Design an enzyme around this catalytic site. Structure first.
Site, mmCIF file in Angstrom:
data_model
loop_
_atom_site.group_PDB
_atom_site.id
_atom_site.type_symbol
_atom_site.label_atom_id
_atom_site.label_comp_id
_atom_site.label_asym_id
_atom_site.label_seq_id
_atom_site.Cartn_x
_atom_site.Cartn_y
_atom_site.Cartn_z
ATOM 1 N N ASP A 1 55.045 36.715 40.445
ATOM 2 C CA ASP A 1 55.374 35.746 41.483
ATOM 3 C C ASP A 1 54.378 34.599 41.368
ATOM 4 O OD1 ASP A 1 52.971 36.811 42.302
ATOM 5 O OD2 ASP A 1 53.590 37.282 44.355
ATOM 6 N N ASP B 1 51.216 33.061 43.482
ATOM 7 C CA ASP B 1 50.307 33.230 44.611
ATOM 8 C C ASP B 1 49.762 31.865 45.042
ATOM 9 O OD1 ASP B 1 50.535 36.119 43.957
ATOM 10 O OD2 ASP B 1 49.179 35.656 42.315
HETATM 11 N N1 LIG Z 1 41.346 43.711 46.459
HETATM 12 C C1 LIG Z 1 40.994 42.482 45.925
HETATM 13 N N2 LIG Z 1 39.689 42.064 45.914
HETATM 14 C C2 LIG Z 1 39.287 40.864 45.401
HETATM 15 N N3 LIG Z 1 40.217 40.033 44.871
HETATM 16 C C3 LIG Z 1 41.551 40.365 44.837
HETATM 17 C C4 LIG Z 1 42.013 41.632 45.376
HETATM 18 N N4 LIG Z 1 43.351 41.704 45.218
HETATM 19 C C5 LIG Z 1 43.741 40.613 44.643
HETATM 20 N N5 LIG Z 1 42.688 39.738 44.375
HETATM 21 C C6 LIG Z 1 42.703 38.374 43.720
HETATM 22 O O1 LIG Z 1 44.040 37.922 43.461
HETATM 23 C C7 LIG Z 1 44.395 38.275 42.086
HETATM 24 C C8 LIG Z 1 45.557 39.209 42.057
HETATM 25 O O2 LIG Z 1 46.648 38.942 42.917
HETATM 26 P P1 LIG Z 1 47.851 39.781 42.257
HETATM 27 O O3 LIG Z 1 49.166 39.211 42.519
HETATM 28 O O4 LIG Z 1 47.744 41.183 42.975
HETATM 29 O O5 LIG Z 1 47.540 39.941 40.656
HETATM 30 P P2 LIG Z 1 48.645 39.309 39.674
HETATM 31 O O6 LIG Z 1 47.865 39.056 38.295
HETATM 32 O O7 LIG Z 1 49.204 38.041 40.181
HETATM 33 O O8 LIG Z 1 49.780 40.475 39.424
HETATM 34 P P3 LIG Z 1 51.290 39.964 39.312
HETATM 35 O O9 LIG Z 1 51.473 39.058 38.012
HETATM 36 O O10 LIG Z 1 51.756 39.120 40.560
HETATM 37 O O11 LIG Z 1 52.219 41.246 39.127
HETATM 38 C C9 LIG Z 1 43.186 38.952 41.401
HETATM 39 C C10 LIG Z 1 42.061 38.442 42.298
HETATM 40 O O12 LIG Z 1 41.595 37.174 41.826
HETATM 41 CA CA LIG Z 2 50.698 37.521 41.982
HETATM 42 CA CA LIG Z 3 51.604 37.328 45.740
#
Ligand SMILES: Nc1ncnc2c1ncn2[C@@H]1O[C@H](COP(=O)(O)OP(=O)(O)OP(=O)(O)O)C[C@H]1O
Ligand SMILES: [Ca+2]
Ligand SMILES: [Ca+2]
EC number: 2.7.7.19
Lengths: 445, 288
Positions: free
Chosen positions: A168, A170
């Site tokens: 998605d 963010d």
């Molecule tokens: N528990 C956490 N603690 C600290 N930072 C976090 C935490 N969860 C998420 N983040 C921050 O946001 C980032 C991840 O959001 P996320 O959507 O869960 O990863 P993603 O790489 O976008 O996986 P998708 O591609 O959406 O499947 C990684 C970090 O920079």
């Molecule tokens: Ca994401």
């Molecule tokens: Ca998200």
């Protein structure tokens, strides 16, 4: 006088005593809604549908009817609470739609080995149909709202490395609620789907739009302008993303969360690509060398299990000799108040904690589980996480962080797997699951 | 003359560094509303800063007329802070608070049964309690004790995550018996009446414990001498090292409160921000 005419025209009926008194004040907002040209709006929504929701099978007749029906819903609503809701939501559209949504229609490869090594040592644990279209609309949204919407997460890294499979997009915005209400309406008018906007209590200034079947469409975190101003950012493909350097720090903090480490074991390669991208970014942008030299990182972390406070020795890198990291945010807040400290630096969901330096001791809160390698011993994965959390503050206030970051990254090299003995639980976060139900004319917070 | 140079004003009682024996021998329109607006803006902004205000229901008991609350409401509303306001008083509120979806006005005198009822109704909403209940001219110690017993009951029943309670210790010479109040910091109030010894007890609750602490006659003596020193000596000073349009102590004190307030509009300096905020507040309350 005129106010009476305003309300009568709005309600399409003579305002009862009860109604006139209650709506009397909204007179000005009501007039704004009435004058708003609905035909132009019907046109804008259709124009938007051909651009981003062409594959949605609904006629122009259906769209027009949904819109005009909503802009007259008040004429058939007698519950004063519902009327306030309808007035509020119609006001959002009338005042913001054209500015928010209307405008929409007018070297990693070499770092993959390093990433695998780092992540391997750490692997020791144990969504509706509309998303496609919404994401595409967001790609545009980001380019047209540089000042109020920035991106982080896989999409932002995807802009650096096309090989990233982002789920998605963010985002952090200064007008999340406005954006989400406008988008929820757009989706409702076009699809007829009764979406629900909800607010989750354990996250900070977070709201999400879900469809009728409770499937996730899109979410957003709201941040103040000052927070937006200081968040480290980079300009890429005409949009602003959070600095990959800052995102790397959060990734490290993130793996302290047991849940995230479990995700790591489930899909190691997903994280490898993301980490490899950020490692290369920092390597090239800051001239960071991965020689495996640990230096004084990670800093010593001692946990007081009874008081749920981890003491981090920071004297080797910062002016403050140590940082007390609380695991209960309400306790930190109370202790800061007792210190008569009124200006703790807050960064909202960006850091999920305030940071206060008082008499050369930093005070902050850690929102993730603390991993332990032994009874009363903090796991190195969490020590890095805590060090990373402290560096967020350094980056947010333009302080020194380069060397410390280099040492932290290097400290992740050539490590043996260390099992997790146990972990602390996150503190409880009280609060209601609020929501806005357009269909039902309900808003509850 | 009656001038002084200060690093900062006394923000909390515990900071007053001197005393003076009370002497019985001892100005702005809508000053009462100003006093409340400032203290609540300060308290609530602090909760905003520490992530407590986000999504909360602010329950205000003894809020009438509450004219200033409308400013507070619009302020946070413009900052995109999600809040539910519940204003409760035995008397009616200012009409500028009517017709707002996000603010519930209740005309009713509160007792334990009513308190239990709204708690059940609000649960699981995070609750922030602000109490300014009063019982006339200068209530009796017995009436103050009764008011504080009520505030304690409010807290035990509502289980708020934080509270701002009206706090004025009974005078030493009119002491009845010791009593208890929640642990908290005692916030001083700028633009409070000339010789008011009233403050705001600010608490942020941890665990499910009010942390009740005892107030003794000895404490009553200290409160009286400390506040008299503040009112008689400190507040009647011009702060010469305070570069602001008005240098009186109360404005210096107001400045340290407003500098902690958030605003999405961007300013060049903190002074410019405070000046804007002060202007906005005075204009709202109709103070020249
Ligand atoms: N528990 C956490 N603690 C600290 N930072 C976090 C935490 N969860 C998420 N983040 C921050 O946001 C980032 C991840 O959001 P996320 O959507 O869960 O990863 P993603 O790489 O976008 O996986 P998708 O591609 O959406 O499947 C990684 C970090 O920079
Ligand atoms: Ca994401
Ligand atoms: Ca998200």
């Amino acid at each position: 006088n005129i106010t009476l005419k305003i309300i009568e025209t709005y309600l399409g009926r003579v305002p009862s005593v009860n109604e006139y008194h209650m709506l009397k004040s909204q007179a000005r907002n009501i007039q704004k809604i009435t004058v708003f040209n609905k035909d132009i709006f019907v046109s804008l929504v259709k124009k938007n549908k051909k651009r981003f929701f062409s594959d949605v099978n609904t006629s122009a007749s259906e769209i027009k009817d949904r819109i005009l029906s909503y802009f007259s819903k008040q004429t058939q609503t007698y519950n004063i609470g519902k009327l306030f809701t309808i007035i509020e939501l119609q006001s959002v559209l009338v005042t913001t739609y054209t500015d928010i949504l209307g405008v929409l229609t007018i070297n990693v490869t070499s770092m993959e080995e390093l990433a695998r090594d780092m992540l391997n040592s750490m692997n020791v644990a144990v969504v509706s149909s509309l998303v496609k279209n919404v994401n595409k609309l967001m790609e545009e949204y980001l380019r047209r709202h540089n000042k109020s919407c920035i991106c982080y997460g896989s999409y932002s890294l995807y802009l650096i490395n096309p090989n990233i499979r982002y789920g998605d997009i963010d985002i952090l915005q200064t007008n999340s609620r406005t954006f989400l209400i406008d988008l929820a309406f757009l989706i409702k008018f076009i699809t007829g789907n009764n979406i629900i906007l909800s607010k989750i209590p354990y996250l900070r200034n977070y709201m999400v739009i879900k469809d009728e079947n409770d499937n996730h469409i899109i979410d957003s975190f709201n941040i103040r302008q000052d927070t937006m101003n200081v968040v480290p950012k980079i300009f890429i493909d005409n949009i602003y993303i959070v600095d990959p350097t800052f995102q790397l720090l959060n990734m490290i903090k993130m793996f302290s969360q047991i849940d995230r480490l479990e995700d790591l074991s489930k899909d190691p390669e997903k994280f490898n690509a993301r980490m490899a991208t950020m490692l290369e970014y920092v390597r090239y942008t800051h001239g960071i060398v991965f020689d495996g030299k640990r230096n004084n990182m990670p800093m010593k972390c001692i946990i007081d299990e009874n008081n749920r406070i981890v003491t981090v020795t920071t004297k080797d890198y910062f002016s403050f000799k140590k940082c007390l990291v609380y695991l209960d945010e309400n306790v930190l807040s109370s202790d800061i108040l007792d210190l008569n400290a009124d200006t703790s630096c807050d960064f909202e969901s960006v850091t999920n904690s305030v940071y206060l330096i008082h008499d050369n001791i930093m005070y902050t809160y850690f929102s993730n589980t603390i991993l332990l390698s032994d009874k009363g011993k903090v796991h190195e994965i969490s020590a890095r996480g805590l060090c990373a959390h402290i560096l967020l503050y350094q980056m947010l206030t333009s302080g020194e962080y380069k060397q410390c970051l280099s040492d932290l990254l290097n400290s992740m090299m050539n490590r043996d797997k260390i099992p997790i003995y146990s972990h602390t639980e996150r503190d409880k976060k009280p609060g209601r699951h609020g929501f806005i139900n357009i269909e039902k004319d309900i808003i509850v917070f | 003359m009656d001038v002084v140079s200060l690093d900062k004003p006394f923000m909390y009682f515990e900071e007053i560094d001197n005393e003076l024996d009370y002497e019985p021998e001892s100005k702005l329109p809508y000053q009462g509303q100003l006093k409340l607006l400032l203290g609540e803006l300060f308290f609530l902004s602090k909760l905003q800063r520490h992530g407590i205000l986000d999504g909360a229901t602010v329950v205000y008991i003894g809020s009438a007329p509450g004219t200033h609350i409308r400013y507070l409401r619009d302020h946070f509303y413009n900052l995109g802070v999600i809040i539910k306001w519940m204003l409760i008083d035995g008397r009616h509120h200012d009409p500028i608070l009517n017709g707002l979806r996000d603010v519930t006005l209740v005309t009713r005198f509160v007792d334990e049964e009513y308190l239990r009822s709204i708690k059940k109704q609000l649960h699981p909403s995070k609750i922030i309690l602000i109490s300014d209940v009063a019982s006339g001219n200068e209530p009796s110690t017995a009436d103050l004790l009764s008011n504080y017993a009520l505030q304690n009951v409010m807290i035990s029943i509502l289980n708020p995550v934080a509270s701002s309670l009206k706090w004025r210790c009974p005078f030493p010479d009119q002491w009845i018996k010791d009593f208890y109040i929640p642990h908290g910091n005692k916030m001083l109030q700028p633009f409070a009446p000339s010789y008011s010894a009233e403050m705001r007890l600010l608490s942020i609750y941890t665990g499910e414990n009010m942390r009740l602490t005892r107030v003794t006659k000895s404490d009553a003596v200290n409160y009286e001498k400390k506040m008299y020193y503040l009112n008689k000596i400190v507040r009647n000073k011009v702060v010469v090292n305070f570069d602001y349009p008005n240098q009186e102590y109360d404005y210096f004190h107001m400045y340290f409160m407003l500098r902690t307030v958030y605003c999405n509009k961007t300013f060049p300096t903190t002074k410019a921000k405070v000046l804007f905020l002060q202007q906005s507040i005075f204009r709202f309350l109709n103070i020249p």
